[PDB]
């Protein structure tokens, strides 16, 4: 929750970080996406790649990203503290992100937050003592008609009730992986009482095309 750093014995500039060689080839592919002379444009994807490899960002992933892109380390520290996905503390293995903005709050995301809390025994911001779950409270995740919903490390679990999210936490404690979708009957975003549109077969190529084209 702090935006200054202090060198702890588990987070210091001599904490061992290095990319795997297949991640060096991934960083080559990332840096080739941007124009020559603008290698600093790959600060966000390579830092996300370092977080995906390591689970979180020590201050050696930031220094390695500054070392392999030839940018100042302060200009990587700015990006790492600005964006709210870069975990500068070690988070749990399943990082649960409950949305509590107004379209999810109106559809009772507080009951889901309370269900996750009394299932895990933690509160907002805490990590479980076995380092499996970190429950934080996030802003709008962009799945608003599927409210209420959480995100667990990559995956959107949508249309949730307390029973649905407790079943998800059960099968995440069981070592399995759940299916990322709406936990009600519907599939992605349609009206739940059947399709109110797009029931007819779509037309295909050549339909309605103007002349001379």
């Amino acid at each position: 929750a702090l935006f200054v750093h202090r060198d702890t014995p588990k987070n210091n500039p001599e904490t061992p970080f290095d990319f795997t060689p297949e991640n060096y080839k991934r960083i080559e592919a990332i840096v080739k996406n941007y124009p020559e002379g603008h290698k600093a444009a790959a600060v966000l994807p390579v830092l996300d790649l370092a977080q995906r490899q390591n689970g979180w960002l020590p201050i050696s992933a930031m220094n390695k990203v500054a070392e392999i892109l030839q940018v100042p380390p302060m200009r990587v520290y700015e990006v790492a503290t600005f964006y709210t996905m870069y975990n500068r503390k070690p988070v749990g293995k399943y990082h649960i992100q409950v949305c509590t903005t107004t379209p999810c709050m109106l559809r009772n995301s507080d009951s889901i937050l309370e269900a996750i809390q009394k299932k895990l025994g933690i509160k907002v911001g805490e990590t479980t003592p076995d380092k499996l779950f970190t429950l934080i409270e996030v802003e709008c995740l962009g799945a608003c008609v599927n409210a209420p919903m959480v995100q667990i490390n990559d995956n959107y679990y949508e249309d949730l009730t307390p029973k649905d999210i407790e079943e998800i936490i059960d099968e995440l404690k069981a070592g399995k992986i759940p299916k990322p979708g709406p936990r009600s009957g519907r599939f992605s975003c349609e009206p739940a009482g059947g399709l109110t549109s797009l029931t007819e077969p779509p037309k295909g190529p050549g339909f309605g095309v103007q002349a001379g084209l």
Binding site: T101, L106, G142, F187, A192, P202, K203
Partner: protein
């Protein structure tokens, strides 16, 4: 046409909106995408920009600027620097979840829109700035872009027209301010997503200091359909200067929260009672509706009875159309708590660059948090009005406007609820 709405499936641009068909290339070609694309690319920039100007397309990002007039700012001879189309796929707006549906379910339509819009402005490549939380959607679009490269549709000699056009995907990292066009440009360049001042406009100095148009997913994805079906077809829908179809996100306190495509100047009551299954508890249970995502001021049930869901009817209704993300609120809602949670969003999503939003959106969160409990006096309502008017029109970008406008809508339509909240606080805590 005097009555709008009731849009048929032959006029829906976003077929396979619901994921009910194959999103891949063998599905997208069988629904109409990537048809006669070489003939669109070989008719030049000026024909395509004329078909976008004639169609009356306005920007679907929330500003509503005329899209053909916007894209013709790039229609100028090169000066050595490359040109870049940039697709705004951030979509951090509360209520808004439609570009997720376009990218997740119609990705080749976004790729063909990138190709057509980049040929129209003479762009070298396309950087799609997708939301970093949309990881499955990003890999979905990446499989589609690999399918469009391996079919020769983009890349070297795109669609066999003698045009070289790359399409990139840049994943964000969790900031709502990176949906603003200059801050998105700053985030592609590898910095903090902090907006630029204008001038320079991005068509002069944009991403990497090149000429650049930033455009929404939806206004890019409808452009091949506007080219194929014609501009007059797309301009036959909605009112004049409000032309076309539109994805509407109805959420909140409705029975069936949904993404739906609908004609532009549809009534809001018809949209809710037709595609969403009504307000939870009937239309008489309606308290307020935020019409277009969080940056637009709310309008109460008396305004929502006859309002039309395009730009001009909502600007005359002292609100905005925005991303057209309909948040529906019933009479069982603490509306001051909802607008306070929305202002809490706007201070946790604000890049902190200039003084009015950085200081005043936090100070509006503190005043709204006292208004929820009632720990205030009625002079502070007009005080909060003047604070919101000091933020509005004084910031670098429009997150100050988009954080001042909900406070203004709440005060303007619900001053009596604030006053009775505070006076019952006074008569039970003193």
């Amino acid at each position: 046409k005097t009555s709008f709405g009731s849009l048929k499936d032959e006029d829906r641009i976003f077929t396979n909106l619901y994921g009910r068909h194959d999103w891949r290339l063998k599905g997208a070609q069988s629904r109409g995408d990537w048809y006669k694309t070489k003939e669109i690319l070989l008719k030049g920039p000026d024909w395509i920009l004329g078909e976008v100007k004639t169609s009356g397309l306005r920007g679907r990002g929330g500003a509503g600027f005329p899209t053909g007039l916007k894209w013709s700012f790039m229609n100028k001879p090169s000066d050595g620097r490359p040109k870049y189309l940039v697709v705004n796929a951030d979509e951090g707006e509360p209520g808004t979840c439609k570009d997720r549906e376009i990218i997740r379910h119609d990705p080749h339509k976004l790729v063909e829109g990138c190709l057509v819009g980049g040929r129209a402005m003479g762009a070298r490549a396309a950087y799609i700035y997708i939301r970093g939380e949309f990881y499955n959607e990003a890999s979905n679009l990446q499989v589609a872009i690999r399918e469009a490269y391996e079919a020769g549709l983009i890349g070297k000699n795109a669609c066999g027209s003698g045009y070289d056009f790359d399409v990139f995907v840049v994943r964000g990292a969790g900031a709502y301010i990176c949906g603003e066009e200059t801050a998105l440009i700053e985030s592609i360049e590898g910095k903090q997503g902090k907006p630029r001042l204008k001038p320079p406009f991005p068509a002069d100095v944009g991403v990497f200091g090149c000429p650049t148009t930033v455009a929404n997913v939806e206004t890019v994805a409808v452009s091949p359909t506007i080219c194929r079906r014609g501009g007059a077809w797309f301009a036959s829908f909605g009112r004049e200067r409000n032309s076309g179809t539109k994805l509407f996100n109805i959420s909140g306190h409705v029975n069936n929260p949904c993404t739906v495509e609908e004609e532009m100047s549809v009534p809001l009551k018809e949209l809710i009672e037709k595609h969403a299954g009504g307000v939870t508890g009937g239309w008489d249970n309606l308290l307020a509706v935020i019409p277009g995502g969080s940056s637009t001021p709310l309008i109460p049930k008396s305004v929502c009875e006859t309002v039309l869901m395009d730009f001009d009817a909502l600007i005359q209704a002292q609100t905005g159309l925005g991303t057209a993300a309909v948040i529906v609120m019933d009479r069982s809602t603490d509306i001051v708590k909802a607008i306070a949670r929305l202002i809490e969003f706007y201070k946790h999503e604000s890049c902190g660059q200039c003084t009015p939003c950085r200081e005043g959106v936090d100070w509006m969160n503190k005043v709204m948090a006292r208004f929820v409990r009632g720990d205030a006096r009625p002079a502070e309502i007009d005080s909060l009005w003047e604070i919101s008017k000091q933020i509005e029109g004084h910031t670098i970008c429009a997150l100050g406007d988009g954080a001042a406008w909900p406070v203004q809508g709440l005060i303007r339509h619900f001053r009596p609820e604030l006053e009775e909240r505070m006076q019952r606080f006074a008569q039970q805590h003193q």
